From a paper:
Sulfurtransferases, also known as rhodaneses, facilitate the transfer of sulfur from a donor molecule to a thiophilic acceptor. FrST exists as a dimer and can be classified as a TST rather than an MST according to sequence-based clustering and enzyme activity. Each subunit of FrST comprised 11 α-helices, two 310 helices, and six β-strands and was divided into two distinct domains: the N-terminal rhodanese fold domain (non-active domain) and the C-terminal rhodanese fold domain (active domain). The active site of FrST was composed of Trp102, Val176, Arg177, Glu181, Trp211, Arg248, and Arg252, which surrounded catalytic Cys247.
Numbering used by the authors:
A (entry chain A): 2 to 300
B (entry chain B): 2 to 187, 195 to 300
Write the structure that this text describes.
């Protein structure tokens, strides 16, 4: 069994059991019941050096249905975690590049499958590296485990296009850049498969670029800073059913994490379809400019 | 009134009233009640030379909602046709580049607004030029007419995503390239493949070398023999966008006379980026899953 990180820094958050410090992790490496998972946008980083004993999840190959636009099923999840020495009761700590952007995404997927003890290493690769902590290129050399086949739950933390169309009048957070938000750009040149034939945002969406929730050192900002950003800045109130979206669900998972686990909103869903779906969908309401715009009637 | 082209070639088709020959148009140009409309994928061709008296429709600016992914509404359509001197009773002959690929699309849009008498110039720009017939580079000075505001009808010849999800068990025609249908290409999406159970009939197979629609015999082999379509079949066609599947809609509705033909305009650009819609790969149709 694997204890919580009692660090004072985390106790102000709604779900302090969802974070650990680099100092805590350095002291727990190799402990029975703990698996450390690297999850990056840039999958090649793991091979340049990883936290010792860490395994890797590759978002290109491991987490998507290979044919359909959907995440893997319970059978594919069970085989992925078993190969990595992960059992149902294992404490998983996930860390990654770009201030745990893809780390939160892996945690979201684990949560679709109802894995209870899943935590982020606050600050990811960047704080581990700034502190001069060790990486290896040694394999985890992992003994296989049996993980149960569970049915994926898309009810609680996931939204589809019809839930979004139905959601108008309820808070909507767009986590893309202001240029994307207004309709000046759609994608990156590195990801042309993440553009769309229309530019803009979902009408009544508040723009909160996801990176605003991360400090320079890549740690999650304080409760006071987050409260400023989402409650004062974006108008969120207790009891609010919140939907977050980006270009794809991978990139709005960090904001879901922030709202579900740090600010403690009960009802937070990631609209994974995001702008790639919305901007290519026939007859969905789109607005342009830096104005959120008026909520239309629920469709 | 504007006479039907009695040409034997067209009389074997289900709706011979939907086609005119270059010979007919040359003999009927400038006749009262006839407006000729150029509709091209390459909109700049019009200024290089156009049939005398012909007006232009520009798919970049004239036919799409500027904000939403949708076609214009009745008020926009009335304004467009009014400006071009088209009345509700006007006979409209549409022609253009790429074997009337986009002419078929314009006719589709006119039919959404229920314009009765719309015809294609069999063989379009390519057969007019090949025959050495006259072009002007004059824009054709036009007196505006009043066109009525009618509600666009999306029911009869248009299909939405949820119509296609509900369609499995009934025929789908995918009009994209073999290398798009297999999922070794993709106006792309992030996913590659085709809709399971869809028969690949690349849209150009229905056109002859000279740009004209193939004989009823040749179409029957393509769509009945090749793709297994039977009388009373409810058919949906799709491409990457609805603009590019309108030609095959035209073939099935007007030439083979299928009663129920719908253009799924969302096409692969929507399908290939929709969350959790069925997709299969390789040159095989695949089997129909249960209607969703």
């Amino acid at each position: 069994s694997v204890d919580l990180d009692p660090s004072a820094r985390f106790a102000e958050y709604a779900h302090p059991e969802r974070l650990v410090s680099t100092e805590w992790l350095a002291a727990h490496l190799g402990d029975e019941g703990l698996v450390v998972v690297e999850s990056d946008e840039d999958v090649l980083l793991y091979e340049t050096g990883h936290i010792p004993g860490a395994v890797k999840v590759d978002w290109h190959t491991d987490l998507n249905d290979p044919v359909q636009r959907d995440y893997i099923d319970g059978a594919a999840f069970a085989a992925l975690l078993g190969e990595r020495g992960i059992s149902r009761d294992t404490t998983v700590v996930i860390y990654g590049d770009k201030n745990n952007w893809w780390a939160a995404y892996a945690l979201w997927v684990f949560t679709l499958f109802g894995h209870d003890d899943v935590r982020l290493l606050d600050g990811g690769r960047s704080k581990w590296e700034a502190e001069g902590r060790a990486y290896t290129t040694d394999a985890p050399t992992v003994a296989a485990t049996s993980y149960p086949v569970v049915e994926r739950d898309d009810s609680r933390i996931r939204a589809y296009r019809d839930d979004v169309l139905a959601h108008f009048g309820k808070p909507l957070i767009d986590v893309r850049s202001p240029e994307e938000f207004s309709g000046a750009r759609t994608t990156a040149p590195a990801y042309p498969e993440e553009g769309a034939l229309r530019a803009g945002h979902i009408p009544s969406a508040q723009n909160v670029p996801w990176g605003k929730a991360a400090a320079e050192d890549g740690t999650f900002r304080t409760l006071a800073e987050l409260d400023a950003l989402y409650r004062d800045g974006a108008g969120l109130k207790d009891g609010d059913d919140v939907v977050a979206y980006c270009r794809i669900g991978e990139r709005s998972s960090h904001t879901w994490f922030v709202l579900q686990h740090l600010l403690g909103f009960e009802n937070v869903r990631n609209y994974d379809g995001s702008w790639t779906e919305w901007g290519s969908a026939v007859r969905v309401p789109i607005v342009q400019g830096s104005e959120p715009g008026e909520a239309p009637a629920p469709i």
